[PDB]
Design a protein around this nucleic acid. Structure first.
Ligand SMILES: Nc1ncnc2c1ncn2[C@@H]1O[C@H](COP(=O)(O)OP(=O)(O)OP(O)(O)=S)[C@@H](O)[C@H]1O
Ligand SMILES: Nc1ncnc2c1ncn2[C@@H]1O[C@H](COP(=O)(O)OP(=O)(O)OP(O)(O)=S)[C@@H](O)[C@H]1O
Ligand SMILES: Nc1ncnc2c1ncn2[C@@H]1O[C@H](COP(=O)(O)OP(=O)(O)OP(O)(O)=S)[C@@H](O)[C@H]1O
Ligand SMILES: Nc1ncnc2c1ncn2[C@@H]1O[C@H](COP(=O)(O)OP(=O)(O)O)[C@@H](O)[C@H]1O
Ligand SMILES: [Mg+2]
Ligand SMILES: [Mg+2]
Ligand SMILES: [Mg+2]
Lengths: 338, 319, 328, 255, 338, 258
DNA sequence: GCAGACACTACGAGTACAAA
């Protein structure tokens, strides 16, 4: 009862964390394999790799709950994130000791109700952060002890994982969560929290999220809280969602394109300064610039080929932690010269 | 089976100083010291498998006669060679009293001496001089730079060189005659070529070829021992056209199982060791392979990145 | 358990030297070595999942018998790579005799490419001194990590990536042991996607048996393989490349977005398929190849670090379009 | 279930101390006849074969064969967590997991319950080869431990030679050499101090000093130790207990 | 003084009413609050808005701050000391004071608070841009696991440094910089209460235009004028620029006037003088680039090349420990361009 | 002595015929001082067509590897103080200097990747080329003045000390000031000067109390005052100003604060 | 039983990291 109320009053990201494997909205190609492996007891070594907010952790926390049961999961599960040191020592001392230990004794209740497979799952969240030495140490630790332990590694980028480690693990790619596949789940959450929306609000939330369900849930919760504070009783509108999602208004983007059209460095610099006097994030500006330029059919193919590469370079630099103003000005000036 | 035969490397190890083929001047000097006596402190440096341990052991045996059991002290990298061994084992061995032939003295052989700790090397400096009347220290190491200069000062520096193909051919022919192995000139030439002056590798490859296939021929030797990786790397780097180099990378390296890190590192080494290409071009290609090496070490190791590296190198060569 | 509750990668681990396929040269040469008794110091170097550990374990089983786990010193060099191990465990094992039966001793060093330089510099004389009674086996993915000295005392065997015949034979054995069927085109897709690794084919086969509604009455088609792995179908790759090459930008964007969204295809997989196909092409000028390869490498490296998927896809489209615009 | 009670809780402590240093991981297999243990060192040079019998326990009950895998270091601590004037109880459930060790003294009512997590050790060869050794000798444990500890200081290798009614222990090192020669003598007034030696063929073989120093650690169990030697066979150093024995199979060095 | 007049409640906020209303909407029901990431131009006033929101959630003792020192040990035996600014209902952590050991304080101290547990204590990460990517990846799972006890509010100036998973995990609240009108109104209230005689009111607008949206800078400049004009601002009062600004301006004059390696000598000397005196290199790069762009003599080609080289070397600096190695390269490339 | 002892065993006459081989076999390979590495690295003869054959690229990598902690810094310090002699036709000194600086920036990136949590020491040969060999080859020639030592170390230590001092003042002022470390130095310190030192410059010895007040408004100490007055640069440098306030005002200020 | 007496194990500070 206490846990039910606690989860009932928590962020909607955590309130609606999938308790079971069926609640996973669109990653069927992995949860189906896990569901059929529930019947058997031959869980492979697994590497969950995909974009953030796709559902790797939720899937791996529902799988253990279904396989072992609530009470027994604590005994048969070892979870290690990047918040814990994961050098060679914590691979050769903590992980190896956990693997060497015999499987915990299932109780009668767990055996009658839950499948209780004869192994334990080690969940390594953010395995990409681990150094190559620790992964090389884990290489044979997973192998020789596969009888009593199973290894799951969750990584945002599969390239960080060393080649033999990824070779041993079954690779599960969690697909991006666009509108088409996750609209049902978003509408489910909205209906459970009595959120009143216009026709395209949920779909628009999903498009701004760009493959991340967690961002969509956060945006929906923010919009719902704003609407409840307003007290009007109307519905959240798409423009409200765009305002709350850090999306540059179409008027300001249009003004930006008009300034790029007139190739004056001083005017572009002044408008860029005035624009950066607002917290319009440069990445969200480059995304909308790409949408406008590429989607529009009034631009030549050669111009599109050049501008796509320019936007790609700007995104690559902006994802490295540089100054947003300088990169945005460089991009706009180079498009003006185009 | 239960028992195994001796490798020809150890079975046919030279037991007298005359059997050692290469580096004639140093070996003749060691024979002259062997006959006369009074061997000074020495540091033997060179490349693997050109007879450095064997030379010092032939010298020590011939000097000490029947007293090799007590007068000679082995210390190897496999043992504990910290400052403790200098304080406790080396010092006690050097202080020991032992009656020897009039010219000969007790001998300390420190094999793999390049791995000695700085503290131990510094502590050995006074043990070398104080007890030199009774004991003579001998060092053998691949790199003479690792041994401290104060130690280098007190000893004669003998530097061994890579063995010429002729001497390797002579030694292999002698082993061929003793072991009655069937051979062809092409097979022997391939063995020397693959060994690249490393006589140890030459003998090991010869014995492996004889065991696996039974005849020393070019085909059998090349089957049991691959053609050198740096050679195919150099051929890929020095290709005239991009497509040819891509074909070499695809067929000879990627399809044959060589890992991307290996290709990039060997490309860097071949580039820095190349001579025909001018230094500026070599440096710029080195920069491109450095970028590629960073990408590979960051986890992105694919045929695409190597192909882009070759494309950049060809652009650099094509002005 | 009964070795049946284990992953197919582990349950189908070879136990005899006759169950290792692909590396027929190495297996035959090593079998002849051990039969005549002139077994040298071995260095098996090769890519992951090519069967080096299985080969050496089966060799130990053949030479020593069933009790090979007490009479062979198998050391995971990743777990213990210090010089203390060389001084204490390795040297004591090599020097002494055997507690079980008379014979020589074998030391199997797994993942010795992680061994520290001091440890290898210590072992280069442990190998030499005790060659009368012991032999050393060194397993390596990367030979550049290993010291040059340790690469001259060991006879070298390279493990090639697994060809079509051996991998196909192993799939045949697996579908015989289970109750499964594989379509010829699906088997072709499995081989193409394997990249020479039996671990990949075993894992994908287990997953494809899992995704079937019921095994032993349904077949595993190419659709099953591609969906379970998530790899792009050749038709999708060809359609995306054709749309990029010979049509306007808008429908090229439409085709890429629709192909990615409908099947959940990732961008990097599409890039790899496209670069493979374009490498299969014949191109009139070198500049096209140079620009195309360099650019796609740049987008791939940027994708590895994350970012905006749409921007990278548009960059790929523009790069291909400009590179083939150089072909006019 | 397993419920095995030692009257002398210090007995199990002493046996466990006997081979805690040699090996860390052990599989105590409890059957109806008693607890039997076999283990191999990391260097794979020494084998330890404990055989405890039913007579040792006050009350021994083993419903079905059970294997308990454990680490010697933690179990040694747990045994040291008990008083001398205590009785010990090993308790194991139907499924082997988290063995319970239970120390009681009822003279002053005190209970001490401890747990030890089991560990999955795959190696269960469980085989020894009884052989007709070339020589069988028996000497007091104190004398043999004294000799081994004093010859270990000269070198790391100790050579044992068995000849016609002669036992020789040699140690040649860098600071010098040493050699002790003993003869088999039978003493009527005090039987425990006698030396027995039955030889079929003279033996000459060497051991390492560290392993001998670790074997002689079992001298606290029995007052007399037997040594079985043979030509290229694992030397048998046996300490006979009241109900069973503790035997070290050592592998001699190669000439 | 800026300290003399700082809003202490949401109802006292005077600029960007939209943000104020959004903060009251979030504070309406505080039992359901996702983690926050405030971002925008420096000097906007985001920290004050965080404090006002915190005051609306908890009681008005949120401003009773106390400094405490918590000693920690790193991977080596070296000892680090962090001063934690704390309140009965919240705490503040600024990783930027440490170097690469920030992960430690992120992984231990935060978790400690989670072990300790108006059921949540807010932790304010004042400097999250300086947070190492490894430290952010360590905070990644602490963010989700302990969401019922710890709720983060992270203050930022640029979102680009922060990795994607963190941005996904927290609600993004933009802070637009106040336009010149609200800055002028605040300055008018300040001069009214501080009794600064004003010849006219155009001085306040000039100060607003000379600060580029910064309210801290505007108020401090107002005080600096009041200390040079005897608390009586005149029409011709020269605007006080901080020392580093004049140094960068003189560096720009030297660069444009003297395009020689001998001039590069003095440019490196000036850069060393700036760097050794507690000035970040990225800010120097930004100011120098914009000052170079503002010089009238150069043609558009030179300005475009300058912005391109500035972007490239800004990326280089973002991926480089030694700051001067990239700043001198930027200056040399600019001098070569001219 | 040992050379003669060893060589005289076989060859009884050491003359001009064999001296070359004796030198080539017995030459001492001593790690050069960083000044010598800088001198040889920035030498025109080394990177010429003829000189490259005598001193191969591998030898230049070895020169870097002699001291891998200072040669990158020495080259960075003394690559702009040389008269070049390998300028390509159509290139000035400034272009070569800019290319060298770009290469040093790339080498700094490589060094950070080498010397960070990833510890990619396998890039050490690459860091040899990008940081030292390539820029020196770009600006190779004669040494114009003297070879100076790396100034980066001293200014880095100075920056660390000033950062520490700024941390103390910032944490002292934290309870009032809503800022970060950098913002304080950027904005407040220029204003803090006008309220701390300028009253001593203008109104006189009666400013102490007022100064003390603002001091006590932010928990500043006398050491804090001395530290704040040491952070200004360029026009607003206070080192000469603090000398020109008469000693009476200083003594009264310290006495009143105490 | 109670106190030292070497001897083993745990802790802490310093240094080097490549290629041939
Ligand atoms: N497939 C999904 N179905 C339903 N809800 C989901 C799904 N994926 C994400 N969510 C929601 O988003 C929250 C976070 O999901 P996570 O599994 O932690 O995302 P993630 O894959 O771990 O991303 P990381 O940890 O940054 S790599 C969950 O608690 C759900 O509320
Ligand atoms: N010059 C030589 N003449 C004859 N056999 C040689 C010669 N050089 C090497 N060998 C063979 O190679 C084996 C190894 O010789 P060593 O001297 O031990 O090698 P090394 O030169 O000391 O290099 P290491 O051992 O890697 S430091 C010898 O036992 C011979 O079989
Ligand atoms: N040649 C082969 N024949 C049959 N099965 C194979 C073969 N190679 C790999 N496998 C399968 O793949 C599994 C892994 O084999 P391993 O030998 O452990 O891989 P590896 O060669 O050691 O590569 P590593 O461990 O990454 S260095 C085996 O248990 C088999 O199921
Ligand atoms: N509504 C407001 N009224 C008065 N002053 C404000 C207001 N908003 C911001 N400020 C001023 O802005 C200054 C700096 O704000 P701060 O929160 O430190 O910015 P940041 O956190 O972005 O660095 C404060 O000194 C404060 O006086
Ligand atoms: Mg997660
Ligand atoms: Mg040698
Ligand atoms: Mg393996």
């Amino acid at each position: 009862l206490a846990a039910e109320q606690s989860l009932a009053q928590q962020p909607w990201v955590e309130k609606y964390r999938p308790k079971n494997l069926d609640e996973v909205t669109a990653q069927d190609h992995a949860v189906t394999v896990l569901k059929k492996t529930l019947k058997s007891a031959n869980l492979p070594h697994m590497l969950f790799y995909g974009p953030p907010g796709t559902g790797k952790t939720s899937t791996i926390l529902a799988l253990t709950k279904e396989l072992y049961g609530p009470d027994l999961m604590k005994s048969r599960i070892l979870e290690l994130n990047a918040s814990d040191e994961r050098g060679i020592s914590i691979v050769r001392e903590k992980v190896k000791n956990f693997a060497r230990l015999t499987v915990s004794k299932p109780s009668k209740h767990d055996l009658e109700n839950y499948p209780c497979p004869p192994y334990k799952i080690i969940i390594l969240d953010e395995a990409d952060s681990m150094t190559a030495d620790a992964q090389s140490a884990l290489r044979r630790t997973m192998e020789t002890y596969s009888g009593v332990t199973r290894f799951c590694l969750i990584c945002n980028y599969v390239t960080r994982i060393i080649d033999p480690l990824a070779s041993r693990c079954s690779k599960f790619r969690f697909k991006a969560l666009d509108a088409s596949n996750a609209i049902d789940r978003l509408r489910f959450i909205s209906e459970q929290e009595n959120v009143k929306c216009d026709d395209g609000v949920l779909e628009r939330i999903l498009d701004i999220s760009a493959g991340d369900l967690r961002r969509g849930i956060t945006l929906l919760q923010s919009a719902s809280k704003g609407a409840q504070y307003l007290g009007d009783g109307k519905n959240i509108t798409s423009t409200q969602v765009e305002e709350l999602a850090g999306v540059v208004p179409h008027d300001i983007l249009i003004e930006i394109v008009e300034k790029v059209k007139s190739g004056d460095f001083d005017e572009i610099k002044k408008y860029v300064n005035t624009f950066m006097k607002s917290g319009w994030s440069a990445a969200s500006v480059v995304n909308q610039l790409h949408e406008y330029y590429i989607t529009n059919d009034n631009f030549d193919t050669n111009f599109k080929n050049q501008i796509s590469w320019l936007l790609f370079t700007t995104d690559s630099r902006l994802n490295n932690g540089t100054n947003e103003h300088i990169q945005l000005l460089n991009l706009l000036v180079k498009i003006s010269q185009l | 089976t239960l028992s195994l035969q001796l490798p020809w490397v150890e079975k046919y190890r030279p037991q007298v100083l005359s059997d050692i083929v290469g580096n004639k001047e140093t070996i003749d000097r060691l024979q002259q010291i062997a006959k006369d006596g009074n061997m000074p402190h020495m540091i033997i440096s060179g490349m693997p498998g050109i007879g450095k341990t064997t030379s010092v052991h032939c010298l020590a045996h011939e000097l000490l006669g029947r007293s090799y059991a007590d007068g000679v002290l082995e210390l190897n990298a496999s043992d504990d060679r910290g400052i403790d061994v200098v304080r406790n084992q080396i010092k006690h061995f050097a202080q020991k009293k032992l009656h020897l032939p009039p010219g000969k003295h007790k001998i300390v052989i420190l094999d793999e001496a390049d791995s000695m700790t700085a503290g131990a090397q510094q502590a050995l400096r006074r043990t070398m001089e104080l007890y030199s009347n009774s004991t003579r220290f001998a060092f053998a190491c691949n790199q003479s730079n690792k041994i401290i200069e104060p130690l280098q000062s007190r000893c004669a520096i003998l530097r061994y060189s890579k063995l010429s193909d002729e001497d390797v051919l002579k030694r292999l022919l002698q082993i061929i005659k003793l072991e009655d192995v069937k051979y062809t000139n092409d097979g022997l030439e391939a063995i020397i070529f693959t060994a690249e002056g490393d006589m140890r590798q030459a003998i090991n490859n010869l014995q492996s070829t004889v065991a696996g296939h039974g005849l020393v021929n070019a085909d059998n030797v090349f089957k049991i021992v691959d053609s050198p990786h740096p050679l195919i790397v150099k051929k890929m780097l020095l290709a005239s056209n991009l497509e040819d180099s891509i074909q070499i990378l695809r067929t000879d390296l990627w399809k044959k199982g060589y890992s991307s890190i290996d290709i990039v590192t060997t490309s860097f080494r071949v580039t820095k060791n190349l001579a025909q290409v001018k230094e500026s071009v070599r440096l710029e290609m080195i920069k491109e392979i450095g970028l590629t090496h960073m990408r590979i070490l960051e986890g992105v190791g694919t045929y695409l990145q190597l192909a882009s590296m070759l494309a950049k190198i060809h652009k650099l060569n094509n002005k | 358990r009964s070795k049946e509750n284990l992953p197919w990668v582990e349950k189908y681990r070879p136990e005899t030297l006759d169950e290792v396929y692909g590396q027929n040269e190495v297996i035959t040469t090593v079998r002849k070595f051990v039969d005549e008794g002139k077994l040298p110091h071995l260095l098996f170097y090769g890519p992951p999942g090519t069967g080096k550990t299985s080969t050496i374990v089966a060799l130990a089983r053949e030479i020593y018998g069933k009790n090979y786990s007490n009479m062979v010193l198998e050391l995971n060099a990743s777990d213990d790579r210090g010089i203390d191990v060389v001084r204490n465990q390795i040297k004591d094992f090599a020097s002494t005799r055997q507690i079980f039966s008379k014979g020589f001793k074998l030391i199997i060093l797994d993942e010795a490419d992680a061994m520290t330089n001091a440890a290898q510099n210590a072992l280069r004389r442990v190998i030499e001194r005790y060659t009368k009674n012991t032999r050393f086996c060194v397993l390596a993915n990367y030979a550049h990590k290993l010291t040059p000295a340790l690469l001259s005392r060991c006879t070298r065997f390279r493990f090639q990536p697994l060809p079509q015949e051996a991998i196909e034979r192993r799939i045949a054995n697996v579908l015989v042991h289970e109750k499964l069927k594989l379509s010829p085109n699906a088997e072709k897709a499995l081989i193409e996607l394997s990249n020479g690794d039996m671990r990949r084919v075993l894992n994908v086969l287990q997953s494809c048996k899992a995704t079937l509604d019921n095994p032993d009455e349904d077949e595993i088609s190419d659709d099953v393989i591609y969906e379970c792995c998530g790899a792009p179908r050749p038709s999708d790759l060809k359609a995306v490349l054709k749309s990029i090459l010979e049509d306007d930008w808008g429908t090229a964007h439409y085709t890429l977005n629709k192909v990615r969204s409908a099947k959940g295809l990732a961008l990097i997989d599409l890039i790899e398929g496209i670069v493979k196909i374009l490498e299969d092409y014949e191109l009139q000028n070198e500049e096209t190849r140079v620009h195309l390869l360099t650019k796609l490498a740049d987008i791939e490296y940027s994708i590895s670090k994350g970012g905006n998927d749409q921007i990278q896809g548009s960059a790929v489209i523009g790069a291909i379009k400009a590179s083939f615009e150089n072909e006019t | 279930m397993l419920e095995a009670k030692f009257e002398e809780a210090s007995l199990f402590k002493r046996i466990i101390d006997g081979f805690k240093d040699c090996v860390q991981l052990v599989n105590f297999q409890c059957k109806e006849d008693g607890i039997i243990a076999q283990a191999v060192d990391d260097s794979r040079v020494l084998l330890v074969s404990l055989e405890i019998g039913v007579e040792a326990f006050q009350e021994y009950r083993c419903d079905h064969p059970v294997t308990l895998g454990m680490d010697l270091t933690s179990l040694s601590k747990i045994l040291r967590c008990g008083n001398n004037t205590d009785t010990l109880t090993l308790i194991a459930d139907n499924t082997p997991d988290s063995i319970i060790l239970l120390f009681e003294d009822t003279k002053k009512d005190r209970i001490a319950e401890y747990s030890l997590k089991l560990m999955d050790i795959d190696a269960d060869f469980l085989k020894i080869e009884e052989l007709q050794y070339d020589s069988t000798l028996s000497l007091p444990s104190s004398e043999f431990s004294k000799i081994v500890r004093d010859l270990s200081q000269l070198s790391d290798s100790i050579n044992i030679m068995i000849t016609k009614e002669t036992i020789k222990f040699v140690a040649d090192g860098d600071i010098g050499s040493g050699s002790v020669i003993i003869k088999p003598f039978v003493d009527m007034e005090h039987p425990e101090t006698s030396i027995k030696l039955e030889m079929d063929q003279p033996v000459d073989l060497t051991f390492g000093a560290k392993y001998l120093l670790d074997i002689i650690k079992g001298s606290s169990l029995s007052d007399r130790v037997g040594i079985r030697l043979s030509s290229e066979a694992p030397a048998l150093f046996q300490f006979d207990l009241k109900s069973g024995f503790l035997q070290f199979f050592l592998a001699p060095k190669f000439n | 003084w800026v300290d003399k007049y700082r809003p202490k409640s949401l109802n006292a906020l005077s600029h960007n009413e939209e943000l104020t209303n959004f903060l009251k909407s979030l504070s309406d029901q505080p039992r359901d609050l996702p983690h926050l990431l405030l971002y925008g131009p420096n000097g906007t006033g985001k920290k004050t808005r965080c404090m006002a929101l915190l005051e609306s959630i908890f009681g008005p003792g949120v401003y009773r701050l106390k400094i405490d020192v918590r000693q920690f040990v790193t991977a080596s035996n070296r000892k680090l000391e962090l001063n934690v600014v704390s309140s009965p209902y919240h705490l503040e952590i600024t990783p930027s004071d440490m170097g690469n050991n920030d992960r430690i304080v992120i992984q231990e101290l935060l978790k400690e608070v989670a072990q300790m547990e108006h059921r949540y204590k807010c932790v304010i990460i004042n400097e999250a841009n300086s947070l190492t990517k490894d430290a952010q990846a360590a905070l990644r799972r602490t963010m989700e696991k302990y969401s019922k006890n710890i709720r983060l509010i992270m203050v930022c100036d640029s979102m680009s440094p922060i990795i994607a998973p963190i941005k996904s995990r927290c609600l993004l609240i933009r802070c637009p910089a106040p336009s010149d009108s609200e800055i002028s109104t605040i300055l008018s209230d300040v001069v009214t209460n501080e009794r600064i005689q004003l010849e006219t009111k155009d001085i306040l607008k000039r100060i607003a235009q000379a600060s580029n949206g910064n309210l801290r800078v505007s108020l401090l400049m107002l005080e600096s004028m009041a200390l040079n004009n005897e608390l009586a601002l005149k029409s011709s009062s020269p605007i006080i620029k901080p020392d580093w600004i004049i140094v960068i301006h003189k560096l720009t004059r030297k660069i444009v006037k003297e395009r020689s390696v001998n001039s590069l000598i003095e440019c490196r000397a000036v850069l060393y003088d700036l760097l050794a005196h507690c000035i970040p290199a990225n800010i120097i790069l930004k100011e120098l680039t914009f000052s170079l762009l503002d010089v009238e003599t150069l043609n558009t080609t030179n300005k475009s090349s300058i912005i391109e080289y500035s972007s490239v070397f800004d990326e280089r600096l973002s991926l480089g420990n030694k700051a001067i190695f990239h700043l001198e390269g930027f200056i040399a490339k600019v001098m070569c361009c001219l | 002595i040992n050379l003669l002892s060893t060589i005289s065993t076989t060859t009884k006459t050491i003359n001009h015929e064999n001296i070359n081989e004796i030198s080539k076999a017995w030459e001492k390979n001593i790690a050069l001082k960083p000044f010598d590495i800088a001198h040889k690295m920035l030498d025109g003869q080394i990177y010429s067509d003829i000189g490259s054959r005598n001193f191969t690229l591998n030898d230049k990598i070895a020169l870097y590897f002699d001291d891998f902690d200072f040669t990158p810094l020495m080259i960075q310090e003394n690559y702009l103080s040389t008269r070049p002699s390998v300028l390509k036709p159509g290139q000035s000194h400034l272009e070569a200097v800019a290319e060298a600086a770009n290469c040093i920036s790339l080498g700094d990136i490589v060094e950070k990747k080498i010397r960070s949590s990833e510890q990619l020491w396998s890039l050490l040969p690459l860091h040899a080329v990008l940081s030292s060999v390539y820029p020196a080859s770009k600006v190779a020639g004669h040494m114009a003045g003297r070879i100076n030592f790396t100034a980066w170390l001293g200014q880095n230590s100075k920056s660390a000390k000033y950062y520490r001092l700024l941390q103390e003042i910032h944490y002292h002022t934290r309870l009032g000031t809503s800022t970060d470390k950098i913002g304080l130095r950027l904005d407040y310190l220029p204003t803090f000067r006008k309220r701390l030192l300028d009253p001593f410059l203008k109104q006189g010895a009666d400013a102490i109390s007022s100064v003390i007040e603002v001091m006590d408004d932010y928990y500043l100490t006398k050491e804090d005052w001395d530290s704040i007055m040491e952070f200004f640069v360029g026009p607003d440098v206070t080192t000469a100003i603090i000398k020109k306030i008469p000693a009476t005002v200083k003594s009264g200020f310290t006495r009143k604060y105490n």
